[PDB]
Each structure stands twice: as C-alpha cells, then as structure tokens.
Amino acid sequence: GIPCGESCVWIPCISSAIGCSCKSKVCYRN
Numbered sequence: 001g002i003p004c005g006e007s008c009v010w011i012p013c014i015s016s017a018i019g020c021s022c023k024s025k026v027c028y029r030n
Helices: none
Strands: 002-007 021-023 026-029
Touching: none
Parallel strands: none
Antiparallel strands: 002 026, 021 026
16 A cells, blocks of 8 residues: 555566556555
C-alpha cells in the first residue's frame, strides 16, 4: 500500500523480483 519508486508504464517490475505490483502504470508495495 506504499509506492515503490519506479513506474511500470513500459517495463513491469516483475522481472526484477522487487516484489511490487503494477498499478496505474506505477509500482506499489504494501
């Protein structure tokens, strides 16, 4: 429920194993 820092407009933050969810083209966590 808190922004991670990077966006996922083009590249999703999945193949990085950061543990963030792509939402509103931006990565969020907890």
